Design a protein around this nucleic acid. Sequence first.
DNA 1: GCGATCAGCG
DNA 2: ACGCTGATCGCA
Length: 579
Amino acid sequence: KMAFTLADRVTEEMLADKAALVVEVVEENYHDAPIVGIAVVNEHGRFFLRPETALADPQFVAWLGDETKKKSMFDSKRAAVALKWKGIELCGVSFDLLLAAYLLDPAQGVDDVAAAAKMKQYEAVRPDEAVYGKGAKRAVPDEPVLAEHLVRKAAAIWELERPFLDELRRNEQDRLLVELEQPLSSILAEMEFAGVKVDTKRLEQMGKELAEQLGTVEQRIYELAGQEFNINSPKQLGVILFEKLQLPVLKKTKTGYSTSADVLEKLAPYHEIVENILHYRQLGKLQSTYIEGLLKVVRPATKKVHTIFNQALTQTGRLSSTEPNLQNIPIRLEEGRKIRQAFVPSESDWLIFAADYSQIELRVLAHIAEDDNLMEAFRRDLDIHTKTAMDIFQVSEDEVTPNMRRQAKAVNFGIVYGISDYGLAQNLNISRKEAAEFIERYFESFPGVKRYMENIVQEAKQKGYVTTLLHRRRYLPDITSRNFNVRSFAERMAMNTPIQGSAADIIKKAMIDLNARLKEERLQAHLLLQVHDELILEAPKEEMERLCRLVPEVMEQAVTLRVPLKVDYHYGSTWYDAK
DNA sequence: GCGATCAGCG
DNA sequence: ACGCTGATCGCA
Ligand SMILES: [Ca+2]
């Protein structure tokens, strides 16, 4: 139905200096994945190209890499990385429909060109899943069906750029797309392609050691239970704990007895089995997710893992990381933290360098709320988390353990983001009236935070959404819900999204500024990971000392707030040492 | 496939 | 009855 040239070679008119481009990669993980087809729509027509012809044509390759040839795309990072795996560079991406749709309304869950086109009443294109199918049935269709689908996706991109930019501009989000998210996309593509090298001999050794400790704990559980059972089975675990052993029931799930760690911790006074269950789950989580899981996704020839940072998924503007998730590598228990010893530089005599923001969301909050005491606290470079721990546990500063700090940190964000007296009581193991008076007290010291909580909720009711400092947006239609519970979850999102999203805006700007600076100074250091407020790099050891001044400065100057930004930084031979 | 659970970020 | 996530596993 749609007209296009099914082309056997590349011609000059496919290389105009503006086009909609589709480089189709069907597999979810696009690392080292087939490119199944190419479409180009421009002023001279609509063209389908087979990748074996276009990607071996030197003039098409030059066009891909020419930054003065502008491409409109959907999910351009996916194309850029699949092309990098083919040894081909993509430059000149000036519009990315996925990131435009994400910015306009992250709740759409826009995952293909069709879902984005629907936002503008454009429906002359099919959903990807209708063309390829799902699951075992998923397949690349016959070439004429493939070619028209790719041409219709590019025809859509061609038509939708203008209405999407128009609405971005009305939302004050046009520079957010063109100067933040699209430059970031190219940077994430370099980080993903570069990968992180893994010491598989060390991982494998930790795996055999764990499997031994697992059995020993597993046997002691069976002997404390007086029988054998599937310790991972909540049916059986619940039966053992709360029927055979008659331990008190403190919580239920939709499906039975809860055995979450906070329940198990409150049962430690009653029976010794519960802490063995705890230790068992921790060892098995390390084994399942971080030894075996990692080794599954290590590319064996290079010993690299190549994550995918999803840039159009979270409702706040954060990234997430998938397959493997390199944003939740263990750190807090020393047994788990050692897995970070298997993450190593990718070259001899290079080192890992990790820099991260100190208390970023509370500094953002002090700026946005304009709370005098909170601003004054960060002007003094106070550690609110440690001060809060001192108060909670009635200890001196030197007595504050890492445990108490991250516990006090959960109270600090709990209170600003709407924890109730009940939940704070359960989290702190204190009475519900103490919990409530503690909350009254903290708002006595930070009344400007309290006003911000009330003001932001009123502003979401009036406007229908909340924004971040760089104008990221999140609609909250449930804020006017008649249902008490639904409305409440929406109010807590109103309190939290502008703070967490602004912290996301800042580190994203930090990454763009950092890359420009590294390039300007002609350094080999390059980014490997982002972990929400943390940047991890690797670099030749000859560069460590320059990076100790460069990276913190770049991150601290990314934005200017009414309080300073603070950055800590470490480097070492493995990710474990970069602390 | 989903819900409970737990690893991380604040 | 703080918010944002992803992987694994049993299935009440
Ligand atoms: Ca931090």
